[PDB]
Design a protein around this ligand. Structure first.
Ligand SMILES: *[C@@H]1O[C@H](CO)[C@@H](O[C@@H]2O[C@H](CO)[C@@H](O[C@@H]3O[C@H](CO)[C@@H](O)[C@H](O)[C@@H]3O)[C@H](O)[C@H]2NC(C)=O)[C@H](O)[C@H]1NC(C)=O
Ligand SMILES: *[C@@H]1O[C@H](CO)[C@@H](O[C@@H]2O[C@H](CO)[C@@H](O)[C@H](O)[C@H]2NC(C)=O)[C@H](O)[C@H]1NC(C)=O
Ligand code: NAG
Ligand code: NAG
Lengths: 152, 51
């Protein structure tokens, strides 16, 4: 990913509107401080439960731009089971981001890891390239760190 | 060797009007060895071997 971005030579990001109905958007952390207030990665959306319910998501994002789109997303591995319920209101469900060409299934692993900046949890980052013809398909039942758009 | 693959039920972008897929895998069995298949569903079994 580091060399994929470097060789590209641009950080040009185009914001995109994804249908996130049934879930709370813009989840923030005390680890990520932006202008003295709790925040998160500017290019990533932390999806939380809505009124103690996380519907099985099936969000689509097609490419009609005649150029490849680079998507960055993650999977939140909560330290404790209590967190899992605090954020997602239910047990983990394998996050699956696919296209006409590829598919990536990642299972959230609940478990405490050595504390980093007092955080026993982690976010594993993944990427998907959507070709001009193709469509980006995200399925999640919790623990997904959704994109906010694409990169050139 | 051993290869464990879990079937992932979920709709993917329709290809030739098919939202399903088949992930292909391969195994090489050496002259001494034995091929052992365990499945409780979703397997696309072989019909034989290739030289
Ligand atoms: C998850 O998202 C996908 C994409 O939004 C949807 O699944 C299926 O999406 C295709 C289009 O990509 C729908 O195709 C439609 O089917 C008719 C034949 O019945 C075909 O002539 C057209 O291509 C038409 O657009 C398809 O209906 C849809 N599947 C279902 C079951 O609705 C859908 O929004 C989501 N799938 C699930 C299982 O929730
Ligand atoms: C999104 O993927 C999930 C699996 O992560 C699918 O969930 C299934 O939901 C139905 C009930 O709605 C049940 O058969 C099971 O609870 C789930 N199946 C499995 C294999 O776990 C879900 O169908 C996918 N898509 C949508 C739109 O729900
Ligand atoms: C968003 O998704 C919901 C299902 O969760 C659907 O009923 C609704 O029509 C969608 N809205 C838009 C604007 O796409
Ligand atoms: C999340 O915040 C961004 C701006 O930071 C905004 O575009 C987005 O619509 C917010 N989400 C909701 C649900 O309003």
């Amino acid at each position: 990913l580091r060399s994929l971005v470097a060789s590209s030579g641009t950080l040009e990001f185009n914001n995109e509107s994804f249908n996130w109905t049934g879930v709370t958007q813009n989840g923030t952390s005390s680890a990520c401080i932006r202008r003295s207030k709790n925040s998160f990665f500017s290019r990533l959306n932390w999806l939380t439960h809505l009124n103690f319910k996380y519907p099985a998501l099936n969000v689509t994002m097609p490419n009609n731009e005649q150029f490849d789109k680079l998507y960055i997303w993650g999977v939140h591995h909560p330290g404790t089971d209590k967190d899992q319920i605090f954020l997602y209101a239910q047990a983990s469900g394998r996050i699956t981001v696919s296209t006409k060409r590829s598919q990536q299934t990642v299972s959230p692993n609940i478990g405490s890891r050595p504390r980093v900046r007092n955080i026993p949890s982690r976010i594993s980052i993944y990427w998907t390239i959507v070709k001009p013809g193709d469509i980006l398909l995200i399925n999640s039942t919790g623990n997904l760190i959704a994109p906010r758009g694409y990169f050139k």
